[PDB]
Amino acid sequence: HGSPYRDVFSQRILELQQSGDMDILKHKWWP
Amino acid sequence: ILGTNYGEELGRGVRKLGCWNPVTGLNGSLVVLRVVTVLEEPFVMVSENVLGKPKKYQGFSIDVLDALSNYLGFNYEIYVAPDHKYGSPQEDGTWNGLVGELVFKRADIGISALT
Amino acid sequence: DSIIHIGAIFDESAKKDDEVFRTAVGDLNQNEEILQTEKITFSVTFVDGNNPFQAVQEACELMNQGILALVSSIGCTSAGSLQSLADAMHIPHLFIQRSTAGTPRSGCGLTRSNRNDDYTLSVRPPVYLNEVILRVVTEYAWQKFIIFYDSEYDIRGIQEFLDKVSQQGMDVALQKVENNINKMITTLFDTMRIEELNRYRDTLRRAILVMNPATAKSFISEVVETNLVAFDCHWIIINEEINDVDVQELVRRSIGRLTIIRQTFPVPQNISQRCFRGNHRISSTLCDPKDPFAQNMEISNLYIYDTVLLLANAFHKKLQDRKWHSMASLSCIRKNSKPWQGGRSMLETIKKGGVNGLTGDLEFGENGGNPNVHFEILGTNYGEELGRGVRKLGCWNPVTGLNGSLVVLRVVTVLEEPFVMVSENVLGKPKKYQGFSIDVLDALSNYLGFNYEIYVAPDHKYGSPQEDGTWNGLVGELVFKRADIGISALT
Amino acid sequence: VYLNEVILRVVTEYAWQKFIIFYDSEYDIRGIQEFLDKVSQQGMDVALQKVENNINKMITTL
């Protein structure tokens, strides 16, 4: 509850989805 | 001030265009587009994938853009739409897919098979 | 009787160089180890440093009195004329370049005729401003910025930097800042509009100030007051000479991020070894950093002290090797003007000298210039807890380059495939986790540059919420703040 | 020296907005400082480049 690392995590989650680095992971555990 | 000219009749050469001095001055008269796209072969097809994301796009829509680009003489960059959605009426709020990127202005043009 | 006599030519602005020069002669004449039986005497003349004929004439009068070496503290305008005179007369010339009004130094670019032997030794190091600034902008990944320079700055000093940024495709604007800033900015608001103004404000988000500290302080205040910059701005100020008072005032007048790059001097730390170099004792006024004079010393003043220390060691070696050549009364621009016969041997003895002083180590390379220099890089920070302030980010020197770049999270997880999956059990409990969630965590750890340790939740479940709002499991670990972050498929 | 004034008038007549200034190894760029300030005030994209005395190496390296 309250954290200064929250902001950079939410930014990185968007950034992984947008880069398509997140899309490789889905195929990996889910072919 | 000297200047070149050319015609088929005269060929190459040079002539006096004008003069300048500090008193009377001069005498004698002398964009990048942002493309949001949605991946769906064969309209936009990935020709080369680097770290699970396309780097070079091929297909019918990209060739049409190379014809458009040469005529207006604009250059572009292509990034993939992160949501993998084309967009359609959102009553839940904000526009998703290609349509939301243009509405909120995160691209200038959208190249896809958007009905 | 004195056989050791040196001459000095100072610009009219260099009164502090004269004070330190006289103090350095005083300190050496009290040192029994160096020049054991001989006192150093001197003749000093002040000249208009923009009059090269006056500089030559007065230097010639000192040579008529008879000197072993000529020390100069002067700008580039008369430097070429003194160097060519020293070459003609065979008088060793110890040249301390002064900048005009605290402007960043640029190379003189005198291009002295190389047909004759060079009697000039350049006491201050090469100008490395262009190299240092290039390294710092590269580290910050800058691609578009503006360079603001003062009215006295020689832009040939950044020509190499401009070529390099252009080769890398950067959008680099130049602008001279007039000595009167208010008129330049006031004229700007009157002529421009909202679009243009937004564009100028964007341009001012990243800037480099190549200017004296006084102009930079005025320039920063005026743009801050007129709201042309904001908290997201990042300005770099570079100059060899910015004192601690100047640094604090620059940080105080600035909003956003400020990087300050200035020359630093690698002197001993211990209080005892501060005012001593071996057995040479330095006057307290120059070496004690709590003395008001020492804190207000110019950079040129430090080099002048070390120059006198170097000359005394050279003269000492020449007298202890039975190679002394007496000084001669020389005449300039006469029918039988002749160089000093002792000059070539004295120049070579001085050139291979080296001393530990107020600048660190003073010595000369083969090219006749001092090679030694160190820059420090300071930077602002902000939190609600600390407020405004400044700290040392790093160091730069031309040998080792840039040094110094410009928490452990407690992770609770719950095993639940395929989000959290045990890749390695050691003693029946996980060491390595893999999974959809974990791969996102390893993209987080590497990217934000944090370290972690992962432990399971006390039951590998999110648990049930106990009566009165009490939580257990993984969730209770977040509420009781017993885990920093939770990596799981937590709903 | 009126080089800076003359060049400004000519670029203005041709309606130039983006260009590169190539200068020799002996040119003093303080001679165009006023021209550079003026083009910047008008929002132009102006590149500078020194041309080395040996051109082939500069272009071959390119």
Curated annotation (Swiss-Prot), chain D:
Q: Found in which tissues?
A: Expressed at high levels in the cerebellar Purkinje cell layer, almost absent in the forebrain.
Q: Where in the cell is it found?
A: Postsynaptic cell membrane
| Domain of life the protein comes from | Eukaryota
Q: What does this protein do?
A: Member of the ionotropic glutamate receptor family, which plays a crucial role in synaptic organization and signal transduction in the central nervous system. Although it shares structural features with ionotropic glutamate receptors, does not bind glutamate as a primary ligand. Promotes synaptogenesis and mediates the D-Serine-dependent long term depression signals and AMPA receptor endocytosis of cerebellar parallel fiber-Purkinje cell (PF-PC) synapses through the NRX1B-CBLN1-GRID2 triad complex.
Describe its partners and assembly state.
Tetramer; dimer of dimers. Interacts with AP4M1. Interacts with EML2. Interacts with MAGI2 (via PDZ domains). Interacts with BECN1, GOPC, GRID2IP, SHANK1 and SHANK2. Interacts with CBLN2, but not with CBLN4. Interacts with CBLN1 (via C1q domain); the interaction is CBLN1-NRX1 complex formation-dependent; CBLN1-binding is calcium-independent; CBLN1 hexamers anchor GRID2 N-terminal domain dimers to monomeric NRXN1 isoform beta; promotes synaptogenesis and mediates the D-Serine-dependent long term depression signals and AMPA receptor endocytosis.
Report the family membership.
Belongs to the glutamate-gated ion channel (TC 1.A.10.1) family. GRID2 subfamily.
| Free-text domain note | The PDZ-binding motif mediates interaction with GOPC.
Q: What is this protein called?
A: Glutamate receptor ionotropic, delta-2
Tell me what gene encodes this: Grid2
| Shown part of the complete sequence | 150 to 211 of 1007
